[PDB]
């Protein structure tokens, strides 16, 4: 059951032949480099077909790169995070990598938890956290 894998592999004429189960084509990584001594038994392999295979390999590279970016990008910097003053892109990325993503949890950890931050001392950490607690907790806004 690999119909969802090679959905667009031979985009010229779908009615060509049946897929060889002996190879499988079900790794998406090992098929990058293979000796040409066994991959010519199937008929109908010309220059445009190899060029299209190279296009598809580059596309698969791009897709796996985007997948790795999405898997590592466990930050989700929303508009609610970049709006707090003194928090540029780098600081917001740091906050999101710490493990926070919303506002109702920022003012629930004391200054003892505001360490390990790069480019931010403890007095400024306290300043920013009491600013946040004034905007959120003392403001009584919804």
TrEMBL record:
<comment type="subunit">
    <text>Monomer. Binds directly to the core enzyme of the DNA-dependent RNA polymerase and to nascent RNA.</text>
</comment>
<comment type="function">
    <text>Participates in both transcription termination and antitermination.</text>
</comment>
<protein>
    <recommendedName>
        <fullName>Transcription termination/antitermination protein NusA</fullName>
    </recommendedName>
</protein>
<comment type="similarity">
    <text>Belongs to the NusA family.</text>
</comment>
């Amino acid at each position: 059951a690999a119909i969802d894998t090679f959905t667009k592999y031979l985009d010229i004429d779908e009615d060509f032949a049946t897929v060889l189960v002996e190879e499988g084509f079900s790794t998406l990584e090992e098929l990058a480099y293979v000796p040409m001594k066994e991959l010519l038994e199937i008929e109908g392999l010309d220059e445009p077909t190899v060029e299209a295979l190279r296009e598809r390999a580059k596309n698969a590279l791009a897709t796996i790169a985007q997948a790795q970016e999405e898997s590592l990008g466990d930050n989700k910097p929303a508009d609610d995070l970049l709006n707090l003053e003194g928090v540029d892109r780098d600081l917001a990325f740091k906050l999101a990598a710490r493990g926070v993503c919303t506002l109702e949890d920022l003012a629930e950890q004391g200054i003892d938890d505001l360490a390990d931050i790069e480019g931010l001392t403890d007095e400024k950490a306290g300043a920013l956290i009491m600013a946040a607690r004034n905007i959120c907790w003392f403001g009584d806004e919804a």
